[model samples]
Target: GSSGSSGMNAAVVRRTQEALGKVIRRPPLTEKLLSKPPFRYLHDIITEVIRMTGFMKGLYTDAEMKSDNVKDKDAKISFLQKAIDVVVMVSGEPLLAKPARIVAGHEPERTNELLQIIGKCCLNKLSSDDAVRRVLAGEK
Candidate 1:
């Protein structure tokens, strides 16, 4: 069971990395735009991405039983937290920013294309209750 748990952890990490790659390739957002009204839209997308990927839970869960094998669980937790922090700072932040840049560039066609891709890959792939309700409500 422990070995299977470790394998599951690795699978989660791999999926997270795959998702992060899509986010990193997004155009880029400016701080000024993100501070304004448009921020809400981008924030929701980012929140959805985090929720769909299970990135937050992966950071906190002890799937490896590190406390039993390692001397300090706090250090392990701290390390995982910092890793997630950096991952979001470097990849996640930019993912949200890109949409603003895409729109500001006056490339409506490009914006639509990217949004479609995100919808297909991220939003459409989600199986959560909220996502399902939104789809059923004709929001998708």
Candidate 2:
């Protein structure tokens, strides 16, 4: 449930950043995120998400999106686009369950690779009492 919540939160944040990007008429802010020195993109993304909490429910609801507060049609479009991107990016997959089952393949190979690495680390830790012992043992 925590992971699902995180994914939802991230989607919200991503959408807000995207809205800001559209408001500025830039490359959606995601592509040029690294240009900002000493500033992490994730920080900005998360902050944007926090800032847009008031609009969270409205973001995913089509009826809500039609409201006056969502005055700008471009912003609305960008919000939806950003939301989808965030969900896919965070989940490390393109399919939203149905496609995942039908396609039945890894959307982001890098994510799977990282998961494997984590699994290996956990296995190593569980196999030995000390890091040095685990490495030297070559127990894999």
Candidate 3:
């Protein structure tokens, strides 16, 4: 991937980092991650999915997003789950599910192509709403 080493992460991830010098790669900020230099980068599709989780819900829902009173406590996981299933169906990458390395956090490439797929989805390189709708139709 000559010249592709910029990263497989989302443009928004790169955007946010550029806009803000420092950012938290993940929540909890465990002691292990606190000492690591790479923890600030987006290593998972979950980072890209968070971008879609906000306003993008307007494309799918009857009303709005982030729900007024219905704010789910564990919001990020919902998007993470959808991104996983959507990537699984689109890529047919069996490794996308029950991600151990993907969940292994911020290191060691594993199904990162799925990460790239979700990144493209967020970037609108692929239709983000189309991906969202396909995810919706899977259950209905």
Candidate 4:
């Protein structure tokens, strides 16, 4: 489904992917490799830290309870729940949902920051069950 990989600017996604792979794979994963000072493993570390925050917790709580938007409460809840679930599933650390809300683009950064605190509270309600983990691990 690629629209051809030949444009001058191309897609930033393609470029980012290329750069990340070049950096992450050459070293790969090894105890000796991870121990090096330069390898902070910032990607996973930051994700875990975000998960620990209360952002994801809030999303779950808000999604569970009915809101004032009567016309689309169910639909909104469904959509929000999916987003929260995705953050927990993909990162294996639920707090990423806070940062993910920024990715959600529904609110300004300040509001999202406040929402992140709530996410932290609901973190335990969600689980990184094997069903989601295997998919992320690239196993059938």
Candidate 2 residue-wise lDDT, 17-131, digit = tens: 4444432332244422322211122223323432433212222344433334444545443433433343333333443322221122222222222222222322333221233
| Residue 132 displacement in candidate 4 (angstroms) | 5.8
Give the candidate number with the greatest lDDT: 3
3 against 4, candidate with superior TM-score: 3
Model 3 misplaced stretches (Cα beyond 4 Å): 1-79, 89-94, 97-108, 120-124, 137-140
Deviation of model 3 at 24, angstroms = 14
TM-score, model 4 to reference: 0.22
In order of appearance, the predictions have TM-scores of: 0.25, 0.21, 0.36, 0.22
Backbone clash pairs for candidate 3 read none
| lDDT (tens digit, per residue) of candidate 1 on 36-99 | 3132333344344445554222332353223334335454334323322333333333222233
- lDDT tens readout by residue for model 3, 15-47: 333222222233432233222213122322144
lDDT of 4 by residue, 15-100 (tens): 32333333233323332222221212322322333345322323233323333332343454353444445444544444422323
Q: What order do candidates take by TM-score, descending? A: 3, 1, 4, 2
lDDT of 4 at 57: 28
